A paper describes a structure:
Actin is the constituent protein of microfilaments with essential roles in central processes in the cell, including transport, cell division, and motility. Outliers of this functional consensus are actins of the phylum Apicomplexa, including Plasmodium spp. and Toxoplasma gondii—both notorious human pathogens.
To our surprise, in Mg-PfActI crystals from which diffraction data were collected soon after crystal formation, a model with partial occupancies for both ATP and ADP (and associated conformational changes in the protein such as Ser15) in the active site was found to best explain the data. Crystals grown after exchanging the nucleotide in solution after complex formation also contained a similar mixed nucleotide state. These findings were corroborated by anomalous difference density maps, in which peaks of >4 σ were found for Pα, Pβ, and Pγ in Mg-ATP/ADP-PfActI but only for Pα and Pβ in the Mg-ADP-PfActI. In the Mg-ATP/ADP-PfActI, we found excess electron density, not explained by water, between the side chain of Asp155, the backbone nitrogen of Gly157, and the backbone carbonyl of Val160. Considering ions present, coordination distances, and geometry as well as anomalous scattering lengths at the used wavelength (1.032 Å), K+ is the most likely explanation for this density. In the Mg-ATP/ADP structure, the backbone of the A loop has a second conformation (conformation 2a) with an occupancy of 0.4. In the Mg-ATP/ADP structure, Arg178 moves toward the carbonyl groups of His74 and Pro110 in conformation 1b, thus connecting the P loop in SD1 (residues 109–114) and H loop in SD2. The fortunate coincidence that our crystallization condition for both Plasmodium actins and the mutant forms contained K+ provided direct evidence of Mg2+-dependent K+ binding in the active site of PfActI. This is, to the best of our knowledge, the first experimental evidence of K+ in the active site of actin.
Residue numbers in the entry:
A (entry chain A): 5 to 40, 52 to 366
B (entry chain G): 4 to 125
């Protein structure tokens, strides 16, 4: 008689809550502040003036285990008010996370937090399940990393996962950069949060970039306002679509990386010919950086161009895809079979 | 250990389960071929081959008004059943009104739909 906790370990935000909910009840920044013992999440940003702030998760991989343990403690004790030693826990991990990292997270859960049972899930796989599919390719673009993850009959294909060399934080930083054209000087950590919100509220993806540059220059209809915290209004023009264009043209960031269309194509090509149709027909978007208006239409055009013309390209953009990893975890950990999937503390300790 | 897994694929025939509150629940045989548009289902067709061996096709059927817990669970239970069957089942996603001819062909009266369904688990 017990309810699992579901924790999606994001580079930018942790999503946490209870199995069987349709959305995480706790979403907070993946930040730990220590004096210049430790503060986490929104409180750390509120006290940035007296704290040094660090991100324990880098491109989806935990790289500061002591600070990550502070994040998990905050999750259980200050967000959920749950005894970790009394609930099963489902924890997410990035595609291609090294087994040594999983083992270190498992050790912390079973020996620091004394969790009684746990299950580790690949983020992209959970998102596929949340879309009602067992086969497809997930493009999961978050704050710190983007992956393309082919999945066949329930399971990722490890040899075909690829990384697109940018994510939402790069897009925030690029908007900060290009707004200097208009005279804006956003640069501090606090200002970066403002610009992240501008990006989310005003950006969009052009269906055809060159044609959008030409139409936006013919009038002011591109321009939109945003009210800053101090009450001043900022106007943003073609930056609205030039910012997320970097997902398709990473050279805008000075990166040689392939864009997200090319990366998706390359990832499908790694898979044997006989399953590619099912992947092209089930391209599923997840994560906050896939939320731009226009993304599905643009991706469809660009992947259709690259792919063999016998293929049928269907890009799926679920409305609640910003939380689809967490939602998939909530579903999985609710199933009548979940109790058979986890590892118990007794098993681990005797292994 | 799930009781329905223990019954799955033991004889030639057709087995239909409905996702109900995060569980697989047998569909009453009288209802086979009628599907609630508000629900998701898992279907296992077992065929006896010439050699005597068994062939498995797993289909998960998604009603136009089913909730995300139901469609997600149907997909996951499909994977788990296939694993139970040692990966031998071919998996098929079936969307209301766009089902494969193979799936339609399991029902001599053809596929029919009904309003409503079991309540979401969410
Ligand atoms: N509506 C939106 N439009 C564009 N970007 C958005 C939107 N909403 C959120 N984002 C961006 O998505 C990112 C957060 O996404 P998400 O929560 O999926 O990442 P995460 O899981 O923390 O990171 P990762 O999976 O990369 O480790 C941030 O860069 C945020 O600004
Ligand atoms: Ca239902
Ligand atoms: Ca199989
Ligand atoms: Cl083409
Ligand atoms: K991601
Ligand atoms: Mg993520």
């Amino acid at each position: 008689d017990v309810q699992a906790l579901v924790v999606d370990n994001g580079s930018g935000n942790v999503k946490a809550g209870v199995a069987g909910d349709d959305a995480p009840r706790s979403v907070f920044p993946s930040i730990v502040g220590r004096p210049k013992d430790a503060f986490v999440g929104d409180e750390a940003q509120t006290k940035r003036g007296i704290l040094t702030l660090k991100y324990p998760i880098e491109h989806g991989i935990v790289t500061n285990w002591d600070d990550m343990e502070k994040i998990w403690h905050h999750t259980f004790y200050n967000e959920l008010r749950a005894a970790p030693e009394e609930h099963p826990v489902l924890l997410t991990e990035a595609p291609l996370n090294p087994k040594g990292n999983r083992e270190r997270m498992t050790q912390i859960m079973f020996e620091s937090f004394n969790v009684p049972a746990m299950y580790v899930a690949i983020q992209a796989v959970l998102s596929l399940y949340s879309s009602g599919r067992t086969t497809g390719i997930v493009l999961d673009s978050g704050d710190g990393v983007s992956h393309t993850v082919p999945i066949y009959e329930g399971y990722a294909l490890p040899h075909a996962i690829m990384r697109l060399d940018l994510a939402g934080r790069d897009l925030t930083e690029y908007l900060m950069k290009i707004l200097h054209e208009r005279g804006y000087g956003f640069s501090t950590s606090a200002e970066k949060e403002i610009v992240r919100d501008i990006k989310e509220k005003l950006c969009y993806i052009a269906l055809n970039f060159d044609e959008e540059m030409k139409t936006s220059e013919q009038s002011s209809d591109i321009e939109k306002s945003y009210e800053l915290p101090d009450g001043n209004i900022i106007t943003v023009g073609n930056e609205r679509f030039r910012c997320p264009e970097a997902l398709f043209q990473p050279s805008f960031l000075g990166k040689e990386a392939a864009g997200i269309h090319t990366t998706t194509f390359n990832s499908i090509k790694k898979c044997d010919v006989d399953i590619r149709k099912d992947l092209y027909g089930n391209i599923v978007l997840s994560g906050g950086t896939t939320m731009y208006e226009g993304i599905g239409e643009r991706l469809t055009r660009d992947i259709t161009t690259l792919a063999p013309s016998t293929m049928k390209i269907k890009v799926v953009a679920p409305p609640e895809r910003k939380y689809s990893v967490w939602i998939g975890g909530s579903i999985l950990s609710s199933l009548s079979t979940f109790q058979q999937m986890w590892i118990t503390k007794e098993e681990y300790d005797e292994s | 250990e799930h009781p329905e897994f223990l019954k799955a694929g033991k004889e030639p025939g057709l087995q239909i389960w409905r996702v109900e509150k995060f569980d697989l629940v047998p569909v009453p045989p009288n209802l086979y071929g009628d599907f609630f548009t508000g629900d998701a289902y898992v279907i296992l067709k077992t065929v006896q081959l010439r050699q005597g061996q068994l062939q498995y096709d797993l289909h998960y059927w998604l009603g136009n008004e089913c909730s995300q817990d139901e469609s997600g669970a149907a997909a996951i239970f499909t994977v788990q059943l296939d694993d139970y069957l040692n990966g031998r089942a071919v998996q098929h996603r079936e969307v209301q009104g766009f089902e494969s001819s193979t799936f339609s062909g399991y029902f001599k009266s053809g596929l029919k739909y009904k309003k409503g369904g079991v309540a979401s688990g969410f």
